[PDB]
């Protein structure tokens, strides 16, 4: 619910969130997977104007056109595989708050089309009747693809694109924030040292160095794996070079 910051790139990013977050503008978070995009969504909601109002958030990852539609929009008893107990929806659930859809770069056209209207004109029809149901949400999308490319590739639309990529933040990699790793590191060292009830404290100066120096391709995701691993493997108190994943040495 915060971040481990400054290193140059890390700073710039903080600068942007600060500047932009004031409520109305939709926001597109771009960057490879592995870096706290979620977090940067968090930081957005927090820093501007609806810091007290809810922060709805779903991940469109792989839910099929159908499920997604419903989950996003609304839905009543008349839906084809046996469940009848009207579901509100998320956009609504956020009405007057903040919606955060993650991994948007692959929604089906149709959903692009809907998602558009969603944003275009405050309305939101439930999966069913003309429940024109207007709403008022501040949107924040995230993805790791070249939306611009998707557009030209013809898999994604201008209209939606041009309505999402209003204010764009670009997520720097773990590598672009060496300076944090250590501190970031300790953070998990503590979560899991506890989760396994293991007494652990401190990295040996050697490991922290390789740590500070590696963790590229799955930035946090990667580190967070590499640590939890050490603590579970650790027979003593300080995680060392031989408690870290092979790709520690396997990289030089």
Interface residue list for a copy of itself (CB under 8 A): 19-20, 22-25, 33-34, 59, 61-64, 67, 70, 76-85, 87, 108-110, 112-113, 117, 128-130, 157-159, 161-163, 165-168, 192, 195-198, 217-218, 221-222, 224-225, 228-229, 231-233, 235, 245
Q: Which of 90, 178, 175 is nearest to 135 (CA)?
A: 90
191 known ligand binder: yes
In DSSP terms, 57 is beta-bridged to 100
User: For the chain, how long is the longest CA-to-CA vector?
Assistant: 64
Contacts of 58 (CB under 8 A, 6+ apart): 71, 72, 90, 100, 101, 102
Which phi and psi angles does 169 have, rounded to 5°?
-110, 140
Alpha carbon 163 to chain centroid, angstroms: 19
**Minimum CB–partner distance for residue 194 and a copy of itself (Å):** 9
**Minimum CB–partner distance for residue 151 and a copy of itself (Å):** 9
Q: Which of 126, 244, 106, 122 is nearest to 181 (CA)?
A: 244
Nearer to a copy of itself, 152 or 205 (CB): 152
221 known ligand binder: yes
Nearer to a copy of itself, 52 or 62 (CB): 62
**Minimum CB–partner distance for residue 104 and a copy of itself (Å):** 14
Q: What is the DSSP letter of 249?
A: T
Nearer to a copy of itself, 202 or 236 (CB): 236
Nearer to a copy of itself, 3 or 248 (CB): 248
* Binding site per annotation, positions for ATP: 34-35, 191, 221
């Amino acid at each position: 619910s915060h971040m481990i910051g400054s290193s140059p790139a890390m700073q710039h990013l903080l600068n942007e969130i600060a500047m932009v977050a004031p409520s109305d503008a939709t926001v597109l978070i771009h960057g490879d997977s592995g870096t706290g995009k979620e977090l940067v969504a968090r930081a957005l909601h927090a820093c501007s104007a609806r810091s007290d109002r809810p922060l709805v958030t779903l991940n469109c990852a792989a839910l099929n056109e159908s499920l997604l539609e419903s989950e996003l929009f609304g839905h009543e008893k008349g839906a084809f595989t046996g469940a009848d107990k009207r579901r509100e929806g998320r956009f609504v659930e956020a009405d007057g708050g903040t919606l955060f859809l993650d991994e948007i770069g692959d929604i089906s056209p149709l959903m692009q089309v809907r998602l558009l209207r969603a944003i275009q004109e405050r309305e939101v029809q439930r999966v069913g009747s003309n429940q024109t149901i207007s709403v008022d949400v501040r949107l924040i999308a995230a993805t790791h693809r070249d939306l611009a490319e998707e557009v030209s590739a013809g898999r994604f639309r201008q209209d939606l694109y041009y309505r999402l990529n209003v204010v764009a933040i670009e997520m720097p990699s773990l590598r672009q924030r060496r300076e944090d790793i250590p501190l970031l590191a300790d953070h998990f060292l503590r979560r899991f040292a506890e989760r396994n009830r293991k007494v652990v404290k401190g990295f040996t100066p050697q490991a922290m160095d390789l740590l500070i120096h590696y963790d590229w391709p799955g930035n946090i995701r990667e580190l967070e794996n590499a640590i939890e691993r050490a603590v579970v493997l650790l027979t003593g108190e300080y995680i060392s070079e031989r408690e870290l994943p092979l790709a520690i040495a396997a990289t030089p």
